[PDB]
Amino acid sequence: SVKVIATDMDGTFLNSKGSYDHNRFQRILKQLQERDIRFVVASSNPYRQLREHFPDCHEQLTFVGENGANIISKNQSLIEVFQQREDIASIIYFIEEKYPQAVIALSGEKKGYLKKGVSENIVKMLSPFFPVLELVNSFSPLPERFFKLTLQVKEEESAQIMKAIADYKTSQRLVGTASGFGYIDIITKGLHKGWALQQLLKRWNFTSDHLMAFGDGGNDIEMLKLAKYSYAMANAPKNVKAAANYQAKSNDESGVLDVIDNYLAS
Template identity: 40%
Template sequence: MIKAIAVDMDGTFLKSTNDYSRERFEKIYQELQEKDIKFIVASGNQYAQLSSFFPNQSEITFVSENGALIFEKNQLLKKATFDSITVHSVLRFLLQLDVSIGIVLCGAKQAYMLEKQPEAFQQFANRYYYALAEVASFDNLPEDEFVKIALQVPEREAKSLVDQLNQHFSKDITAVVSGHDSVDLLIPSVNKGQALLYLLKRWQISASQLLAFGDSNNDLEMLKLAEFSYAMANGSEEVLQTARYVAPSNDDEGVLTVIETWLAKMSGIT
């Protein structure tokens, strides 16, 4: 019996139009509440951005910044942060690379980017970070606690950059490809899977009662945890190999289709 559902957003729950079928989901959400099934948004994105997609569903739990920040009923429940020495070291390393990299420093309060960035990167940052400030330099860090560093890189460079960062900062960060041209630098041992494990223990729910959906490599731990794990048809090779099942693509609203199938099964409708 399913007791909790966790969904990634970009490439999974959201269509390429950066939206979802709201009327269809509202019907599903009402049934989930009636059946006391938890709905969890588990994303690498910022809480301010994620919550804006669900203005009328206050019971949704948000695992944001790839598990560093967990919000339940709009209240911060759990937080994991980098130490400032690591943040300084990583930023200095990134800024001296001979590769065009856009950097968003993600804090618990808001996100930060350098001033006068290319327009394409500004659009990227504004799409994913609703609480975003520009700073003149990363030499003096803002007064905040830092939970993630998000990068936009040329797609052809993403995998090699991840390998380089994981080798150079093996004990301090975990670098993962989070999209075709996106790389996330995470706190080691902090990921969606660990965040979900914390929530399941809090709610006294077993991983055998968890349904999860993902498409990118920052979803791997979450998919390994869930008994009923679904890779989106548009997912990465690693995700398709890890998940137990495959859902239709995000543009075919695969998440909603699979959830409806499960709800019908639980209601005895064939």
């Protein structure tokens, strides 16, 4: 009895080439709509970057970006929660002083920011997760309103740095969540994809019993635990599989659309 379908993007809905079966999807979408089944894109990426994947139908979908702080539906802003400048400045000072190896990117309403001096190769890596990317000589004072920050770090120091963040004075406001191999999103504490879906379920008057959800990452775990019909991609790591009730094929075998066509076929 599925009424909302929510999917992660990178590593899940998207294949390893960063694309998906457009035709198969649009035909599925027509089906979902005529059944009043809601479709939710739930990603750490900014909304502006998520809509580009759905050029011809984005206005018919709901988007959860920034892991949760920004929600758009029907091409309209439903929720936008910004971090406090004082908190941002403070966690930045802490990371610069304590973990100089982490590359810091700020994710703003309209663009992203890196510090000048970051290597071209990093700039080239990140520039994909941002509409526009501006380089500044300092973060103090700050530039725009910001949904989240992103740290690029060695995957092996990831846990340590996340714990350092959780133990810092900004603790009640800011928390890290693994948003990919070698990445930590510093989000407003509690504003994760599970929270986002709860807000949408509560607003559409459904329960988690009607939720089907797909993920492959740490930042998908609250969402997966929430959804009764929770799917870890075949390519997800053990801990993310632990949070799911069902396993899908890999993102390179259209694992998401496969499950959806299966449900519909039911």
